[PDB]
Amino acid sequence: DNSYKMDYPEMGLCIIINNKNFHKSTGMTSRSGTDVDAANLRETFRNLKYEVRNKNDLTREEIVELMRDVSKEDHSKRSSFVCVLLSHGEEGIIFGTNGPVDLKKITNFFRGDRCRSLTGKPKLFIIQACRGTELDCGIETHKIPVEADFLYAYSTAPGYYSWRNSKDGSWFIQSLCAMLKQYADKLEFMHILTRVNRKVATEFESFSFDATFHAKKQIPCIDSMLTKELYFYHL
Amino acid sequence: NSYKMDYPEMGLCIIINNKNFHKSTGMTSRSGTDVDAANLRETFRNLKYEVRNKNDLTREEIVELMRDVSKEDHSKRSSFVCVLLSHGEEGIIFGTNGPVDLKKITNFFRGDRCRSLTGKPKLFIIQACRGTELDCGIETHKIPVEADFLYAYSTAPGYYSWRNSKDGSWFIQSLCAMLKQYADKLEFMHILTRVNRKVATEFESFSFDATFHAKKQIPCIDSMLTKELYFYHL
Amino acid sequence: DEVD
Amino acid sequence: DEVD
Numbered sequence: 001d002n003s004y005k006m007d008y009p010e011m012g013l014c015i016i017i018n019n020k021n022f023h024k025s026t027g028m029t030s031r032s033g034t035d036v037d038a039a040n041l042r043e044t045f046r047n048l049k050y051e052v053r054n055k056n057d058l059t060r061e062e063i064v065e066l067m068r069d070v071s072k073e074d075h076s077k078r079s080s081f082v083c084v085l086l087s088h089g090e091e092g093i094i095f096g097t098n099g100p101v102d103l104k105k106i107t108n109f110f111r112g113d114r115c116r117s118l119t120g121k122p123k124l125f126i127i128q129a130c131r132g133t134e135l136d137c138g139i140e141t142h143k144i145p146v147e148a149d150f151l152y153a154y155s156t157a158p159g160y161y162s163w164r165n166s167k168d169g170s171w172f173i174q175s176l177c178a179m180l181k182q183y184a185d186k187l188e189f190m191h192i193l194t195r196v197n198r199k200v201a202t203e204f205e206s207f208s209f210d211a212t213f214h215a216k217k218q219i220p221c222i223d224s225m226l227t228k229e230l231y232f233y234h235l
Numbered sequence: 236n237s238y239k240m241d242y243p244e245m246g247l248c249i250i251i252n253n254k255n256f257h258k259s260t261g262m263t264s265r266s267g268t269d270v271d272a273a274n275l276r277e278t279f280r281n282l283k284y285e286v287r288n289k290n291d292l293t294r295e296e297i298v299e300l301m302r303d304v305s306k307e308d309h310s311k312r313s314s315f316v317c318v319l320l321s322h323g324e325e326g327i328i329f330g331t332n333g334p335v336d337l338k339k340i341t342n343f344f345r346g347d348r349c350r351s352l353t354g355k356p357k358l359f360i361i362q363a364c365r366g367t368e369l370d371c372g373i374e375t376h377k378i379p380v381e382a383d384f385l386y387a388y389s390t391a392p393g394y395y396s397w398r399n400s401k402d403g404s405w406f407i408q409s410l411c412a413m414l415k416q417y418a419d420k421l422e423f424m425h426i427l428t429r430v431n432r433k434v435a436t437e438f439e440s441f442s443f444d445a446t447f448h449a450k451k452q453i454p455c456i457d458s459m460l461t462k463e464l465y466f467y468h469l
Numbered sequence: 470d471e472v473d
Numbered sequence: 474d475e476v477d
Contacts, residue, residue, distance in 0.1 A: 113373035143372030145453040217379035227432040
């Protein structure tokens with residue numbers, strides 16, 4: 001059993017939280033282009049046969065409540081769980097429309113001992129958010145652990161900004177959807193994400209009238225506590 | 236696509252084995268770590284790495300060692316491996332006399348600071364605490380300067396990492412066994428996933444102290460690699 | 470391009 | 474078994 005069982009009746013839920021407009025208390029910019037991301041993800045995971053639920057502009061209270069409620073559903077007939085977070089962020093932190101919440105508080109509901117119908121099933125958290133404010137200048141070329149079976153697909157390295165394009169969407173979500181579309185019927189998930197890493201690292205470079213933000217680079221970060229290989233196809 | 240691993244040399248494997256700590260730090264001796272260091276030496280020798288074992292380094296000696304190694308000419312080397320065996324906290328590895336930021340160590344190998352490793356995989360294998368949480372378990376320019384690093388952590392963020400005084404650490408035991416079994420068959424992320432499964436399923440702590448008994452561990456693969464890594468070429 |  |  002080197003591969004997760006992915007032939008349950010349902011692939012599972014894909015929760016997309018798309019935070020675009022932020023309250024003035026938190027003081028934050030609108031995240032132009034994130035609607036492109038949310039739509040790309042909806043279509044991408046629809047074609048992978050996930051039950052997609054799009055949510056927009058949730059407060060941090062609403063994020064925690066949504067995650068609590070979803071973790072209390074019966075996932076028995078579901079192979080996996082996916083949550084995509086599109087928002088501003090800091091290291092370990094995602095922003096509701098009205099302020100920060102620790103990622104650990106969101107993901108804890110899905111721990112092996114707290115969401116029993118997902119125990120032993122892959123729980124994927126895909127995070128398009130800053131992890132800090134560094135820029136990458138680039139260079140010219142039998143129990144199981146309660147924390148097991150999580151994958152965090154971070155858009156950027158710890159400590160760094162994550163780049164978004166107001167017309168095309170974020171670099172990471174653009175590349176993620178493109179690689180899932182091309183390779184989900186061929187490659188194991190870590191190899192898909194490695195191609196995402198390559199695509200973001202090599203094909204994207206910032207263009208800015210402000211020299212301090214110009215010609216910058218990005219590498220995503222795959223954080224796997226999975227115990228098996230993950231294939232989105234069957235047979 | 237796959238990293239080019241047919242350079243004349245696979246590369247260096249630096250093993251820092253901290254067992255004995257200065258009395259004034261209050262840190263305990265890490266019984267079992269010599270088993271890890273010898274297991275790692277043989278495992279990476281078999282993979283044709285130029286292994287260098289270092290033992291009981293101060294925080295000063297760790298920084299100087301890594302600065303010096305990053306200043307070597309790696310042009311004929313396919314890859315670089317560093318294994319850290321010590322006490323730790325999140326983001327921190329301990330020399331014998333105090334802490335070192337992991338970032339300080341790895342920054343020497345950034346794509347802009349070690350040009351002869353640019354575009355080559357840089358693997359940091361870390362057997363150390365990331366905190367004090369216990370897992371009770373449940374019954375069942377052209378490229379980024381941060382690109383091409385992989386951090387293979389023994390344990391999840393925030394958690395203790397377990398070591399057996401006779402057999403070595405759970406993670407290094409499992410890493411060496413999976414490399415020995417699968418390095419001629421599987422891509423590296425798939426090897427580390429087997430290591431994840433082995434640690435998560437086969438190990439459980441036995442302790443006379445109820446607080447520390449029947450606990451579990453899941454390692455954490457942190458990949459900023461841009462290609463698949465295979466230890467067999469041609 | 471913008472940061473987020 | 475011991476913690477590091």
